[PDB]
Amino acid sequence: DKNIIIGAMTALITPFKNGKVDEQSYARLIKRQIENGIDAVVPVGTTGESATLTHEEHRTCIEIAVETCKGTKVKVLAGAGSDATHEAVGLAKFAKEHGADGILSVAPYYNKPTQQGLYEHYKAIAQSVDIPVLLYNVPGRTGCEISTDTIIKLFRDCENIYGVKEASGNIDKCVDLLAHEPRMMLISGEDAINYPILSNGGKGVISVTSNLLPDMISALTHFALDENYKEAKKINDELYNINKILFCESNPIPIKTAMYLAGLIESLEFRLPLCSPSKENFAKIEEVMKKYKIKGF
Amino acid sequence: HHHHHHGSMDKNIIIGAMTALITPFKNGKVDEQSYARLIKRQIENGIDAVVPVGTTGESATLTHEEHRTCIEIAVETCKGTKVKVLAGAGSDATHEAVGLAKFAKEHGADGILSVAPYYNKPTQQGLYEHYKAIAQSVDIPVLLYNVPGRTGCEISTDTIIKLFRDCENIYGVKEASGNIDKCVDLLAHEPRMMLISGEDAINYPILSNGGKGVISVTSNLLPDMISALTHFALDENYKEAKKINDELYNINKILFCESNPIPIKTAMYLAGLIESLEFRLPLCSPSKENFAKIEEVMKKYKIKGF
Amino acid sequence: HHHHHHGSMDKNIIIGAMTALITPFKNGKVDEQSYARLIKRQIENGIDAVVPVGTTGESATLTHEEHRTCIEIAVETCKGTKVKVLAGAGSDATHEAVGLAKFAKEHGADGILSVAPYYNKPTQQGLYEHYKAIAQSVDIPVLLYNVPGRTGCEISTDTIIKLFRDCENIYGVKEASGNIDKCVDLLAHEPRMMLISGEDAINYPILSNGGKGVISVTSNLLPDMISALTHFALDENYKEAKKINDELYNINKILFCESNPIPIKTAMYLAGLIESLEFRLPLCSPSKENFAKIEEVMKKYKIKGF
Amino acid sequence: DKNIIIGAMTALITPFKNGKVDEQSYARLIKRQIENGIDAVVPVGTTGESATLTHEEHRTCIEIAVETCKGTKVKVLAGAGSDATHEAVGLAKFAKEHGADGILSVAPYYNKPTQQGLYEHYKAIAQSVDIPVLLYNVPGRTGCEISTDTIIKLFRDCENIYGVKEASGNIDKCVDLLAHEPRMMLISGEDAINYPILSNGGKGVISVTSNLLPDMISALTHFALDENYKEAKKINDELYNINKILFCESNPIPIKTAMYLAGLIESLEFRLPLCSPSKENFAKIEEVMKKYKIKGF
Ligand SMILES: N[C@@H](CCCC[NH3+])C(=O)O
Ligand SMILES: N[C@@H](CCCC[NH3+])C(=O)O
Ligand SMILES: N[C@@H](CCCC[NH3+])C(=O)O
Ligand SMILES: N[C@@H](CCCC[NH3+])C(=O)O
Ligand SMILES: [Mg+2]
Ligand SMILES: [Mg+2]
Ligand SMILES: [Mg+2]
Ligand SMILES: [Mg+2]
Ligand SMILES: [Mg+2]
Ligand SMILES: [Mg+2]
Ligand SMILES: [Mg+2]
Ligand SMILES: [Mg+2]
Ligand code: NA
Ligand code: NA
Predict the structure, then answer these.
(1) Could you tell me the distance, in angstroms and rounded to a whole number, from the CA of residue C272 to the centre of ligand 1?
(2) Strand partners, C197
(3) CA distances from B71 to A79, B66, B130, B268, B306 (A)
(4) Which of B145, B144, B74 is nearest to B110 (CA)?
(5) How many CA atoms lie within 13 A of D164 on its CB side?
(6) What residues are paired with B85 via a beta bridge?
(7) How far apart are CA B196 and CA B214, in angstroms?
(8) Which helix (H) or strand (E) holds A188?
């Protein structure tokens, strides 16, 4: 009864070259996702360094994702979150006007809105567009938590709001959400627990690991959606070691390191305050990667 | 000699739907008649094992004599049925935990549950030595139990796995930790162990990841539902197991609106399954507001009698 | 060349009683007239410095243009008085934080406050490089600001001390971390730095351990009391400083019953110091119950007007 | 208006010899506390391994402390806490009948009583004796927190209850307590922050560090009680490094290690589940100790 964006999705890294977005590398990486079974891509979330891109660069990345996915089955769920509602509304409207299929919108970071404030924030965002809106709860980064009651209120009050990406390590809340509002789309935002969230009726993932292993994350998700829980769990178990090492330092530091280690990006460049991992973690990531089958271009 | 290759050797296991039994009091004493009646009710409603005197059974405030009496009643009531007794045997002192383990073995328990030491916060090395001493003292199965919110310590995944591999009788862990990532970690690195849900609201997610049973609070009140849930999941009927887990969320949540076992004893009293709402200090009755919340949540569930 | 021995070299410091200024809105826009009037009221009530556009001033929802306008109003209103402007200049993007730092320098601020990056959780190495870039971009004092409950990250004691020793202009930290152990750690290992209280309820404990000022929310409402408290403590009149800190506990606590600045703007509205109770989303009015709690707590304090 | 036990106090380690309490070593260690300015000793708290002593051994330790302090100015604040009220009442009555000056009583661990339960627990304990009772809040070990409201209610409702030993890293609560009930005795239970608690009007410490450095902890406390905050802070600052290293593993593992390293106990023996520190932390403790002046016997 709602328009939705579900399935296996990738929180795209943003490659830099000489401090600027490498727009050619960005398109090439998206094509690699498309060719490895991914159902949607998410430009410029946390993994794509939304904090340090300018609003102009953020918009360019959304445009490249839309352009690269045009004529393919793959949807663009554009990163559009902000701690300021007026900025989040501006990004939402841009995404809509520029052909995104939907938006992801992180809970406001830093300023710690109340539940009433979160409700008004997301209602303003939903009112600004006519495309699907996925909430995104990540309290370890934002300092706030969108409660189950608030999520369900938004889902019932706002046609566009169709679910939530949960990055909260809280499978109890995942049960609470789908037991009380089974129509919503619960999306895993934590790779290590993709299979538990899917096996409780979640309908997709927004993945960091899929930057490196898109075929494995897509296979996992599609097995679970087909109720082949044995085969989905097998992949989730196999992926635990890489899923864990990709957070040995704050995301996206390990995943960009891994993409560089596999020759998939040309330089290991971040924007401050992000920076290279320690040499010890660089080497740890490399050793974990050697246990997995990494697709090229 | 000791060795590191026990993981695929015969570990007698105790799995399935299990109940963390409340301990009813009458005039301050254990009501042994009521205790037996309650265990019989679990047996008649599909439960696979009972756990006398865990946290839910007020292990902290029973004397060592009363703790042993409850184990004996559980063994006697389950004798001749298929239902096993996984006796609560944990302590923050290794010498007390070894004493309880030996008692359980000598008095016919099928296995023991053994909570991580509370209060004194041992290191991982100390936890390893604690559980090695317990496992070496008996020849019956030992289930570890991690509940960091109550103990102040955590048995790490690496320590759990070492104990499983290093000790013949340690066969798994009951997790009450709100940490489905750790549940994945445990079974991805040591799939031979028995992961047991210790948090009712997430029984189905743990079982669907390959956990093999539950040690339940809710089953004191709704044994039939918890056993049906567990057995559906063990049969890989995940649709039907999830349906019950979802239906149970409201009661599963309200049973922790105050520290367990305050809500479950309140519910058992409200349903007419125990005669008085009695605890031993420092536990006590819930607030009037929470008493009323529990009563309202219960109206949506069909409560079996005796 | 860079070096590691800045600790005893001239660090121009900004210390004393300071106010994290609220930013009043009128019809959604910054009310620049009200802002100036409020700053003048701080000046006339003993405050040593003002902090435009920190967390309390809704830095997240001001545009970069409005943020700069508020810095300019603060500088102009304090010109010719002894009161200094420690401009809010923090960001989760180093390039934005450097831009704000340079603006503050070029537009006459006396120094900058710079919050640890929120949301993107940089490593300690990244925080070091962040603040090195900021400090190297200007020649005015830089105060670090740690508030892990809002940012999701913590500037460790070792990183703070390295920055103090390695950068000429970094002179201390504003701690809003509920961690008096860290306050001891900081000043026991680097007593030359300026530790500034960022949590009003514990202003006196931080000052009595050798902290040298406060960056206050409560002083928006009670500037006289917060400045008197701070100045008593700096004079080693701990008895009189503690007396005020104790008297202020109730208002200090209620001003965080919802996320700052929701309660302080509510109180400023209730006292008649701002004309409308307006925030920018995602901030909004308090619940009716908390509005009423704030109003009741305020009745015990004598509120200065203009 | 209340009888109180305040000043510099030591949470006594319990030495073992061949697995039994070394009663001669215990007395010798208490005499060393007496001769180095300490105002009271606390037998068998957390630091004295209350969890693994038997009830008989616990009682023996209280008796040795009372006997050794008789005829000196030093008081015995006997450890008497339990997670079972009936056990805590039994210990309280024993201490009273055996000549202790007061009791310390830890908040119930493991079973997580509600505030009403904590109130009834401590009221039962206070009703059982006619000597002073000090509450003890240590949420990191017990899993519960005695709220300020509950502490103040107990102080006002129970003559014997005269204050609280706080081990909660919460100087805000320390302000809350003494601003609303300035008659109580707030006692520092965390060595690193002894000086902040004293300078806000706390009136003593129950120390781990004083096992090793009793003269320094007593000097610190007495300077603060005399309003010589400069000299108290100086000692608190000097002690930070040892105060921190004594919790590099769970107390009392480091402090027993330090006492062994200084030749003050003959064997580094614990009762399971406590055990020796790692060899790396053993060496770290030794290196920190070399910066301090350690009194002998
Ligand atoms: N650094 C600011 C602006 C980023 C704008 C592009 N996403 C923030 O993190 O909100
Ligand atoms: N109250 C003590 C003894 C309990 C003995 C019977 N389980 C404890 O919690 O360890
Ligand atoms: N909302 C963005 C931009 C604020 C710009 C003015 N301080 C942030 O919080 O970083
Ligand atoms: N091990 C039990 C009994 C200790 C009895 C002597 N303090 C407990 O920690 O409560
Ligand atoms: Mg977003
Ligand atoms: Mg093995
Ligand atoms: Mg147990
Ligand atoms: Mg592991
Ligand atoms: Mg230096
Ligand atoms: Mg700032
Ligand atoms: Mg340090
Ligand atoms: Mg005690
Ligand atoms: Na609509
Ligand atoms: Na009395």
Answers:
(1) 35
(2) C175, C214
(3) 57, 9, 22, 21, 21
(4) B74
(5) 27
(6) B50
(7) 5
(8) strand A185-188
Inform me whether the C-beta atom of residue B180 falls under 8 Å from chain A C-beta atoms: yes
Distance of CA B54 to the CA centre of its chain: 6
Partners of residue D109 in chain B, C-beta under 8 Å: 92, 118-119, 152
Q: Token pair 């030992």 is at which residue?
A: B142
Contact (CB, 8 A) for B133 and B126: no
Name all domains of chain A by residue range, CATH numbers in brackets: 2-297 (3.20.20.70)
- Chain B residues with CB inside 8 Å of D110's CB? 55, 60, 92, 118-119, 150-151
Catalytic residue among C11, C84, C174, C265: C174
In whole angstroms, give the CA distance from residue D266 to residue D297: 13
Distance CA B145, CA B89 (A): 11
Q: Which residues, other chains included, contact A41 with Cβ-Cβ below 8 Å and sequence gap of 6+?
A: A9, A10, A12, A30, A33, A34, A65, A69, A74, A75, A76, A77
CB contact under 8 A, B120 and D273: yes
Whether the CB of A191 is below 8 Å from some CB of chain C: the reply is no
Count B/D contacts: CB-CB distance under 8 Å. Answer: 129
Q: Residue A288: which region, alpha, beta or left (left: phi > 0; alpha: psi -120 to 50)?
A: alpha
Method of determination is X-ray
Tokens of D226: 């005399």
Q: Is C92 in the pocket of ligand 1 (CB under 6 A)?
A: yes
Option in D192, D229, D240 nearest C208 (CB): D229
Pocket test for ligand 1, best of A82, A94, A103, A272 (most atoms within 8 A of CB): A82
Distance CA D227, CA D232 (A): 9
Report d(CA C231, CA C238) in Å as an integer.
Answer: 10
**Residue C51 distance to chain A (closest CA, Å):** 17
Q: Which atom of ligand 4 is nearest to the CA of D44?
A: 7
DSSP three-state, residue A40: strand
- Cα-Cα-Cα-Cα torsion D80, D86, D92, D98, nearest 10 degrees, comes to -110
∠ CA A156-A159-A161, rounded to 5°: 80
Q: Which residues surround ligand 12, an ion (CB under 5 A)?
A: D 45, 79, 81, 104, 106
Query: How far, in Å, CA of B124 to CA of B13, rounded?
Result: 24
CB of D170 within 8 Å of a chain C CB? The answer is yes
Cα–Cα distance between B200 and A156 in angstroms, integer? 28
The verdict on whether C105 is a catalytic residue reads: no
My answer on whether omega of the bond before C282 falls inside 30° of 0, hence cis, is yes
**CA angle (C239 as vertex; C236, C240 as ends), nearest 5:** 85
Ligand lying closest to the C-alpha of residue C181: 11
Beta-bridged to residue C20, according to DSSP, are C51
- Where would I find the H helices in C31-179? 32-43, 64-78, 94-106, 124-136, 148-151, 157-166
**D136 counts as catalytic:** yes
DSSP run (H or E) holding B219: none
Q: Looking at chain C, list the stretches that DSSP marks H as alpha helix, in order from N- to C-terminal side.
A: 32-43, 64-78, 94-106, 124-136, 148-151, 157-166, 180-189, 203-208, 223-234, 238-247, 249-254, 262-270, 288-298
Q: Most D CBs within 10 Å: which of C156, C180, C238, as the mutation test of the D interface?
A: C180
Work out how many CB contacts closer than 8 A connect A with C. Answer: 129
Q: Using the 8-state DSSP alphabet, how is residue A245 labeled? A: H
Q: Alpha-carbon distance A285 to A288, whole Å?
A: 5
Resolution (A): 1.6
CB-based contact C301:C222 (threshold 8 Å): yes
Tokens 């902040």 appear where?
D196
Q: Cite the DSSP H helix spans in B209-287.
A: 223-234, 238-247, 249-254, 262-270
